[PDB]
Amino acid sequence: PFSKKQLKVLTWWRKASPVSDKDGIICDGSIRAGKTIVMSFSYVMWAMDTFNEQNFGMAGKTIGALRRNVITPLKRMLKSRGYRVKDHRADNYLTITFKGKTNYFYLFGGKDESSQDLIQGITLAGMFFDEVALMPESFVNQATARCSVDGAKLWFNCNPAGPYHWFKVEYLDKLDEKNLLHLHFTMDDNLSLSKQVKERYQRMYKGVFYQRYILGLWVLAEGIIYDMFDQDEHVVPTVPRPYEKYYVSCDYGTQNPTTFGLWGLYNGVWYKVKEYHYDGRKENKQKTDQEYYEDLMKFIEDIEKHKFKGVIVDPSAASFIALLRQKGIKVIKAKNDVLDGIRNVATALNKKMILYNDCCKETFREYSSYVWDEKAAERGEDKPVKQNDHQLDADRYFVNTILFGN
């Protein structure tokens, strides 16, 4: 059952609509708001109805994310309303056919400055951007320039960043200058969610991430990053427990500190059992891959080897990963996306999915000093100041790699 706002997304482009003159539409706001599915479905509906034998673009942060977030569920919905879809998996495009009409839908990723160059020779009757605020402005300009065919429209879907972000200042604050519609969504616009489910999603977020992902507000990131960390709630005594499973998580440094964290599952909660912290700068003696391999074996001497499920390491420590696999130790590549990892660590703390033994003392010193970069925020980037973060980067790899899936 669709809300009034959802129906506006489905109908704005029709001849009967007063706003069909507009060059495009922007939908922003909270998570779980039911905006992504109707936006992608209305995009296809619009394109099949208005053109034939034409090319259309669809882009996300990565192709993988676009398929997971948009394309997979869009195909299920299109099939149920009688659209026929041939997915060209290796070529990354779709052929869609409906009431004797046929159009083609090419899939893109937008990651950086190089992204604009990736395709400059295709010609398009339209462009759809999922998670536009995580894309480089350069890519969005390149792709808009390829929309040369007459009657072409631009479609934008996102959640908020901060208020100096290029998409907020150049697009949302210049609506009439670009001739765009704007609709803003919260969870009240998704009628398929009960009041009990909405409250469970609310409790995943506090502070800045609550303001962005629940209230749908473009608010500045400022000061202490993990301002929900609370020594009355998140710290427990250093005592033996009957853990069912273990991992180690690592932040590799030679000219900087290396760290390990031992993590143990027990009654549906992952515990940071203890921490390793070697500062090579302060000791006046740097360490080799071999020496860190040795220290890691000492660090895990006392655990049942059948319960130890491997080391989580960043791909940039490729030499270290090679030595570990040579010695028979399992290795898991860290999902290292910074802003996502930070958001998920905060959610883990908010729901007490993780807890810390009181021996993790360097980790706690970092929790009270890790801050957002104020200068970057005023330029529209959300970035941590890269200091006092060697335990916390490893904790982030653990949370983002093991506790969070899709």
Residue numbers in the entry: 13 to 418
Reproduce, without paraphrasing, sentences from the article in which this PDB structure was first reported.
Most dsDNA bacteriophages and viruses utilize a powerful DNA translocation motor to package their unit-length genome into a preformed procapsid. A central component of the motor, large terminase, consists of an N-terminal adenosine triphosphatase (ATPase) domain comprising ASCE (Additional Strand Catalytic glutamate) and lid subdomains, and a C-terminal nuclease domain, connected by a short linker sequence. While both domains are involved in interaction with DNA DNA translocation is powered by the ASCE subdomain using energy released coinciding with ATP hydrolysis. The nuclease domain is responsible for cleavage of the genomic DNA concatemer at both the initiation and completion stages of viral DNA packaging.
Subsequent soaking of these crystals in cryo-protectant containing a high concentration of NaCl resulted in a transition from R32 to C2 crystal form (Crystal form 2) with each of the ATPase domains of the three subunits related by the crystallographic 3-fold axis adopting a unique stable position. The final α-helix (α6) of the nuclease domain is followed by an ordered extended C-terminal loop or ‘arm’ proximal to the ATPase active site that contains a bound sulphate ion, which was present in the crystallization condition. Initial attempts to produce diffracting crystals of ligand-bound complexes of the full-length protein failed, despite thermofluor data showing stabilization of the protein in the presence of magnesium ions and either ATP-γ-S or ADP (ΔTm of 7.8 and 2.3 respectively), Inspection of the structure containing bound sulphate ion in the ATPase active site showed that in crystal form 2, the C-terminal arm of the nuclease domain occludes the ATPase active site and likely requires significant reorganization to accommodate an ATP analogue. The C-terminal arm, residues 418–427 of the nuclease domain, lies close to the ATPase active site and thus may play a role in ATP binding and/or hydrolysis. Indeed, closer analysis reveals that this ordered extended turn contributes to the active site through an arginine residue (R421) at the tip of the C-terminal arm, that is in proximity to the sulphate ion bound in the active site. Additionally, the carbonyl oxygen of the preceding residue, L420, formed a hydrogen bonding interaction with R44 of the P-loop of the lid subdomain. Superposition of the structures for the full-length protein and the truncated protein (with bound sulphate or ATP-γ-S, respectively) positions R421 close to the α-phosphate of the ATP-γ-S. ATP bound in the monomer active site cannot be hydrolyzed without the participation of the trans- arginine finger from an adjacent subunit in the assembled pentamer, which requires significant rotation of the nuclease domain with respect to the ATPase domain. This monomer conformation is stabilized, or ‘locked’, by the C-terminal arm.
